[PDB]
Amino acid sequence: YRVVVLSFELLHAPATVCGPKKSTNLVKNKCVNFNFNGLTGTGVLTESNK
Amino acid sequence: IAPGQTGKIADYNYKLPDDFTGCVIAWNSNNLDSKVGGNYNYLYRLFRK
Amino acid sequence: NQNAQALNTLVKQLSSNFGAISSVLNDILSRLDPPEAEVQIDRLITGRL
């Protein structure tokens, strides 16, 4: 049946291997908890500062 | 059918709690619930949200 | 200096594994299943305490 099986080692989970391709608008100065990709943390909305 | 177990039987039909406290008892009884050509009385859920 | 250094060495201890998979509760909760993560979360709890 031409089986294909991935690995998902997860020993390097804090990486940049997330690709859902989501475009969500973000607005800063608000108590929010969110995280795209993996870095063991959480951030604040709005991007493109420096 | 045990604490902290997965699978279609343990995820769609009957799942023990992680803090379960009791005995699990099982045996084989193909004598009393089978017939030539198969016994179709027993149905198990295979799909659920 | 003594007070500041003691406070800093208390805060810095959050990054140690204490014998667990990771030093972050979110990572260990997401990577590992609930019933098999308490055995590893409790070590981190004991270390922090």
Amino acid at B40: Y
Q: Which two tokens stand for residue A16?
A: 């940049």
What does the alpha-carbon distance between residue B44 and residue B11 come to, in Å, rounded to a whole number? 12
What does the alpha-carbon distance between residue B27 and residue B43 come to, in Å, rounded to a whole number? 19
In angstroms, what separates the C-alpha of C8 from chain B's closest C-alpha?
39
Residue with tokens 């391709």: A21
| Structure method | cryo-EM
Determine, for residues B18 and C34 on separate chains, whether the beta-carbon distance falls below 8 Å: yes
Query: Nearest 5°: CA angle at C45, between C42 and C49?
Result: 140
Residue with tokens 């177990």: B5
What does the alpha-carbon distance between residue B11 and residue B47 come to, in Å, rounded to a whole number? 10
Which residues, 6 or more positions from B47, have their beta carbon under 8 angstroms from its beta carbon? B12
In angstroms, what separates the C-alpha of C30 from chain B's closest C-alpha?
16
- Decide if C40 contacts C20 (C-beta within 8 A): yes
Determine, for residues C34 and B3 on separate chains, whether the beta-carbon distance falls below 8 Å: no
